[PDB]
Scaffold this active site. Sequence first.
Site, PDB file in Angstrom:
ATOM      1  N   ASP A  62      30.383  37.085  42.586  1.00  0.00           N
ATOM      2  CA  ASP A  62      31.985  37.373  42.214  1.00  0.00           C
ATOM      3  C   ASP A  62      30.927  37.695  40.120  1.00  0.00           C
ATOM      4  O   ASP A  62      30.789  38.285  39.805  1.00  0.00           O
ATOM      5  CB  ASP A  62      32.978  36.033  42.239  1.00  0.00           C
ATOM      6  CG  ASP A  62      33.133  36.525  43.786  1.00  0.00           C
ATOM      7  OD1 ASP A  62      33.216  37.995  44.517  1.00  0.00           O
ATOM      8  OD2 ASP A  62      34.306  35.539  44.118  1.00  0.00           O
ATOM      9  N   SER A 116      34.179  35.882  34.505  1.00  0.00           N
ATOM     10  CA  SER A 116      34.610  35.498  35.787  1.00  0.00           C
ATOM     11  C   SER A 116      35.390  36.250  36.552  1.00  0.00           C
ATOM     12  O   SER A 116      36.821  36.402  35.714  1.00  0.00           O
ATOM     13  CB  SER A 116      35.031  34.331  35.441  1.00  0.00           C
ATOM     14  OG  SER A 116      35.277  33.320  37.074  1.00  0.00           O
ATOM     15  N   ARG A 117      35.450  36.917  36.975  1.00  0.00           N
ATOM     16  CA  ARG A 117      35.905  37.792  37.637  1.00  0.00           C
ATOM     17  C   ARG A 117      37.083  37.690  38.531  1.00  0.00           C
ATOM     18  O   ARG A 117      37.802  38.298  39.675  1.00  0.00           O
ATOM     19  CB  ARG A 117      35.139  38.573  38.440  1.00  0.00           C
ATOM     20  CG  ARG A 117      34.007  39.377  38.577  1.00  0.00           C
ATOM     21  CD  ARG A 117      33.298  40.170  39.076  1.00  0.00           C
ATOM     22  NE  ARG A 117      31.683  40.858  38.468  1.00  0.00           N
ATOM     23  CZ  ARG A 117      30.908  41.861  38.923  1.00  0.00           C
ATOM     24  NH1 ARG A 117      31.175  42.473  40.040  1.00  0.00           N
ATOM     25  NH2 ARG A 117      29.869  42.250  38.384  1.00  0.00           N
ATOM     26  N   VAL A 118      37.791  36.346  37.840  1.00  0.00           N
ATOM     27  CA  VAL A 118      39.117  36.214  38.811  1.00  0.00           C
ATOM     28  C   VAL A 118      40.122  35.985  37.662  1.00  0.00           C
ATOM     29  O   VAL A 118      41.609  36.668  37.629  1.00  0.00           O
ATOM     30  CB  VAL A 118      39.026  34.885  39.031  1.00  0.00           C
ATOM     31  CG1 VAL A 118      40.332  34.788  40.007  1.00  0.00           C
ATOM     32  CG2 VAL A 118      37.935  34.898  40.487  1.00  0.00           C
TER      33      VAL A 118
END
Lengths: 105, 157, 170, 529
Positions: free
Chosen positions: D329, D354-356
């Site tokens: 991710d 960070s892909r969240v």
Amino acid sequence: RKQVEELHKESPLKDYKLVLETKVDPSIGGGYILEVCNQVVNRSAAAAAAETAALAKASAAQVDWTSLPAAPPRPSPSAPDTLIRLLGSVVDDLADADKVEQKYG
Amino acid sequence: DAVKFQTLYNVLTGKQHLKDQVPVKDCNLTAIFGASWKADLNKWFDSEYAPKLPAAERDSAKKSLDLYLKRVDLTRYTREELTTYGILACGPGKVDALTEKHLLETGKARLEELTAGLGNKDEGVNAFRKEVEQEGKYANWPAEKSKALADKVIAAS
Amino acid sequence: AGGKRYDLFGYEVSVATGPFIEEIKKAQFYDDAGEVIVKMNLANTPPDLQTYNAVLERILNCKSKRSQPVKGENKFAAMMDILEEMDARSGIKPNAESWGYVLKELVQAGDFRLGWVCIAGMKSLGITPDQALVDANEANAAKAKAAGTDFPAYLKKAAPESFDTKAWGI
Amino acid sequence: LEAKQKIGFVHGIDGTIATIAPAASKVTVPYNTVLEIAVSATNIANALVFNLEKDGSIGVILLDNISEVRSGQDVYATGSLLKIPVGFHMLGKIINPLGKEIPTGTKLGLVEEMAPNIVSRQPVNYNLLTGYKVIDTLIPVGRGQRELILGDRQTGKTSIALSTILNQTKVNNEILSKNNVLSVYVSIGQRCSNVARIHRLLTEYDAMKYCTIVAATAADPAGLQYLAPYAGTTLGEEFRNSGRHILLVYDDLSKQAVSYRQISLLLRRPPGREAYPGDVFYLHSRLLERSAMMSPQKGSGSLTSLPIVETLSNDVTAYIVTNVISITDGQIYLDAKLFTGGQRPAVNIGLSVSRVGSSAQNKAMKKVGGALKMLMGEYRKMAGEQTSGSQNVSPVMIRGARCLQLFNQKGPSYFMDAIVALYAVTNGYMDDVKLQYSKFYEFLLLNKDLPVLYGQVNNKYFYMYNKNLNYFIRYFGLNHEILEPELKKYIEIHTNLFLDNYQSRMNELKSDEDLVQLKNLLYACKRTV
Ligand SMILES: Nc1ncnc2c1ncn2[C@@H]1O[C@H](COP(=O)(O)OP(=O)(O)OP(=O)(O)O)[C@@H](O)[C@H]1O
Ligand SMILES: [Mg+2]
């Protein structure tokens, strides 16, 4: 023999005739080795005695008598107000010395 | 069994250090072991270690083992009690009498302290019995022995 | 006989929570209650507010987390992690009963500052505390006030006049 | 009763691999299954099937007792996949990937399983506090997430994960055993002394209760280094199915790709780019797509993954590097130019994302991270300027530099101990002090309560001594009516007491002895805080 033809029945093939050949091992003095239909069962002294010795060896190795066991864990101190009122500033030094002695001594 | 007893013999004879910055002590060894220390040690010796080697080294080995057993029996006591309160100053043969003397004397002193602080000899004796029983229970010490000791100190007072 | 519940994927969800709430109330160490929550959630039965309040009751009333003792146990942190699992994860929100169980623990622990936090959080959420607990909070506060236990002792001692990595204790 | 089935005899052996020659023709072996080789009457050498051939021969990966193999030895077959023991009884141990325990000083789980499908996994909701402010604020790591760790040799790739393991322990001892996140450290091809020092570190800080270690050292066979991370994910299987949480740490995957290349090339697979077989992307894909945040139907369990990949000359163009950036991710890129340039952890924010985002981190961290992202995006545009307007510096030029000072650490930082330190930055209370005393400031803010010492105690509850306000901050948030004013009437007094008593005495130092002593004091504060 009984085990031979019983294994030949347990095999996926049984219509085929069975030819049996018996040979001699100088290394093995007790027990047998049987192979039928590319299925082998070894019940020999060299294997059984070494298996039982391996269990004892593993059990003896499994414990570290030279090491020290994990003492039970210590919960939080929760010092009392009376002792704190008696010794305000000293309990920190005493706790540090307790850690020092618990590690070294 | 034989493994742990060989480790024990090596530790006593000094051919091996224990597997941390840990000292050798009766407490710090019997805690690892099964509390059958001396009897099983001597039995394993006489069974499996004495008949192997000749009598010449066997005599000195038994000698050294008795010495180290006495030394760990002496090691049982604490350093402060050993030095300051004078348990060892006379010698090993007198360690026992000096321990008994120190015990009776400190018991009398604690009893006098309780009576001076509280009075009420019945109450003081009861508090002394409670304290002695609790300290015995904490030190893994027989309750009947503690009660007999307390009664002895009270009689001697 | 109630509004049917659904998961995030729209699947139908069970509501038969009683048999697990009974195992929670029958529990004796408040980590087994969490394990019952887990075995409940595996069966497509998610916990409800009544179940969380039963768990907070079992937490408040149990002695220890597990059979053996554990260093670092905090009776409050488990409850406020259940409440984070409530508000954030599951979307459910606590109630006066929940914050009541929370405040009872801070009363027993004597921590009057976290107590006052809970008293303020209640009224900021419309909840109203029990004066039996508010008065005990103020009693613990007055006791620590007169006793000097308003703060710990290690803060109320002088600092090194000279800068030294050892004197400051690092 | 139990008759072992034989398939052939040992034909050839080339180091870590072997080739079997089958005895009969109607015998048939499965694929990926375990075989056994009777190296002696006593011992057995486990193995695994990796190739099958038109000649009937079998390409085999060996895993134990390789030195005892010969030509003509009887070869057996279990007819089952590779499995290992799994359970809570394994926590607190270093372990061979074959399940054998490595000394120091019932259930079975499949080693290769399919991943949770698109219905059997929930999105990321909860955070994972690694202890470092850059990773807790700007690169929020969550649970059920898989985030790469890039970096040159000796930069902190291992240390970020160790600090995560050491930060989570205090929390896990407080929270229940359902919400606690356990850990697994997989060392592929590493050195046994590094493993010993890691074990002693965890044993010192008592982080070993909530950690197991899967060791496949450098002297270990390449097949064992190959099947180590699958053993790790196999342990994660049980905590998935039991709804628990767990963290995985795959030490260098480059050494697992060198091992897979070794295996495939010795088994005469065709090479590819950089001599790899080609499906090492599918390899790491199988390994890493098993990471997930499981659905509430499946217990709401999880397994986080922090794989580590070594980097050469700070390039992101190598084959395996791109293949893993493709999979994971996010990423924590550690720049050797910054490690060498002073700052530690040497995180490069331009290449680490960070892909969240907000959904992972906390309500109290959403409002701080959204300000720090703007602040760092603006400081990125100005910080190239050698500061000329010393007094005309922007507040962003101030806050950014002080925030970088707070980013300088050695060990993990507690969440409460991070937020209360960053709030002063973001609101400009820590602007009159100089840059160098920004951490001694924090030290007094967390361990020497100034208003508690000097008697200026007007706050009713808000003090940093209690340490249980972490959960109220985490739940209610900083922008709340009950917590905002007490927070400000703690921080402004802390700043005023500092600026009056400490800053003055510091600026009055002239001697070299005293300046070196204050130097070493601030470096010690930069390490410990
Ligand atoms: N934040 C930090 N502050 C101070 N020292 C650090 C920090 N991070 C890493 N170091 C130091 O860098 C050295 C190597 O760190 P680490 O063990 O993480 O390297 P690594 O990433 O594992 O590389 P390799 O796997 O090749 O050893 C150690 O001496 C460690 O103390
Ligand atoms: Mg490393």
